């Protein structure tokens, strides 16, 4: 029993953690084979890196210093072609991932890992972060079987305090760019299939407060959903909640007329797995991963 | 900016988690060093449950029969032995991936991480924090045993949990890493519950400091308290008294914020009478306890958003 948000553990990640400085920045690198990945915001990024070499480049893992023997850019992201290939690189891929999609953050500063949290990109593309200066770089990423899937790399903090990145390719989440100007977040929603499949978690949690004996059709639930900001649901988004309607016996428009409830009456007074608010950052995967156990 | 519930990285714990097996019981141990460490309770027959002796249990047991498993190598038992709650298991190779550690017990209201593991294979981290009532709302199902609770300072890691059960309310009770129980539990299944629970009042001051440093002070009020009267007004809300050492312990994001402690006892004083009105602090609309004095000056800046 319990209901957590929880990272992935984040220990093959941290074995890829450097430090890159160039002139007066310092921020966090991503080690894996023979290139370290980092913001290209560390150097027109063209006509700036041209005027680089390879030694203006100090890459440090631990207490070792790599030696830069090529650097090339991609998108937003710099590749630093080094000597050595990092023996403790693990399984991997690049992932990008779509809005309402969780993963966890290992913050770091100085090229070592301080924090690991778990967060979701917002439907605006930003993430409610945790960072300070010197966090750039630090990487998002979910662990399948014994597979590292890479789908995040701090940038930038925006006005409101929430956080905007890359993925492993150097292509921005959301309508940002890497440079000091007028950018904001744009309104927010909340991820609605995210607060259906929580509140499945807090059926099976023995939550149950909530529940009613109505339906709603799919198209009367997105009328009303539209009303408080919330993302329409799709029939993707059912088909997905299937697993957990199933094990539950509450189906997905059963619950959805109990979340159209919450809308309209609050939660008077009353939590749901220790919270007042309708939480949106777990998936259905995550839920049903979380109740099962599954290991890497 | 930002404030998160964030757990220390779990690697240098990742590289200690094995899997113990003794009968038909599989749980987790944590090897460090040539030791390896994980509940006694691995030698129950769950009919034994109630009323274990373990030392009667314990003598019956030879090296053999506790199956260590590495990933996918099988460590050998060299020795045994019981400590409090806790076996330790003598293996003949020492873990080459044991950080530098210590063993700590913590006090209630102290936060940790825990490595959510299941034969010996880590699933999840978390962050969480001792409970007054001496349990931790973890997320663990069966099989959880043995997973470990822990904080890194400065690269070394203090180990202060190992969880062992799981209460009829859903909560956890475990021992520090010397085999002592957090709390009056006994590892019986015997009728134990965990007493009423209370709220961590210095890591909701720690909160609202942190609150006010990210640049929020809606909840602030003209009005200071002395530490009896907020005393008697917290305790009608189950919340736990504050001490001049928690007074003491704040002074830090006292000096950094402007705002005296018992000024920010005035505001929570009112929070507690007003509720939160549709406004939320720092993405919450509970009171949030499970962050210390000590993690808000970890977690957030030198410097306060004025
Ligand atoms: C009727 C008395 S009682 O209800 O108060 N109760 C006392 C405690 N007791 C007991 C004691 C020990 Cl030392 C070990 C175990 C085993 C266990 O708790 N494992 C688990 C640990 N974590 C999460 C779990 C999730 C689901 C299933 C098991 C979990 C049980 C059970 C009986």
Request: aromatic share 10%; with cysteine.
């Amino acid at each position: 029993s319990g209901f957590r948000k929880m990272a992935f553990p984040s220990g093959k990640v941290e074995g890829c953690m450097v430090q890159v400085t160039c002139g007066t920045t310092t921020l966090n690198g991503l080690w894996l084979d023979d290139v370290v990945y980092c913001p290209r915001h560390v150097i027109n990024y063209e006509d700036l890196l041209i005027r680089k070499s390879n030694h203006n480049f100090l890459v440090q893992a631990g207490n070792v210093q790599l030696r830069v023997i090529g650097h090339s850019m991609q998108n937003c992201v710099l590749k630093l072609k080094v000597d050595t290939a990092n023996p403790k690189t693990p399984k991997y891929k690049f992932v990008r991932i779509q809005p309402g999609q969780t993963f966890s953050v290992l913050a770091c500063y100085n090229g070592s890992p301080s924090g690991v949290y778990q967060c979701a990109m917002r439907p605006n593309f930003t993430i409610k972060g945790s960072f300070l200066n010197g966090s750039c770089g630090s990487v998002g990423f979910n662990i399948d079987y014994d597979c590292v899937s890479f789908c995040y790399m701090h940038h930038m903090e925006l006005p409101t305090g929430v956080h905007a990145g890359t993925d492993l390719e150097g292509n921005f989440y959301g309508p940002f760019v890497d440079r000091q100007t007028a950018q904001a977040a744009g309104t927010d929603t909340t991820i609605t299939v995210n607060v259906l499949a929580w509140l499945y978690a807090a059926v099976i949690n023995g939550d149950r407060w909530f529940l009613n004996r109505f339906t709603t059709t799919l198209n009367d639930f997105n009328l009303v959903a539209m009303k408080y900001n919330y993302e329409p649901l799709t029939q993707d988004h059912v088909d997905i909640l299937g697993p957990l309607s199933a094990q539950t016996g509450i189906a997905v428009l059963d619950m959805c007329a109990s979340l159209k409830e919450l809308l309209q009456n609050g939660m008077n007074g009353r939590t749901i797995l220790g919270s007042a608010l309708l939480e949106d950052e777990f998936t259905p995967f995550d839920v049903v991963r979380q109740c099962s156990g599954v290991t890497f």
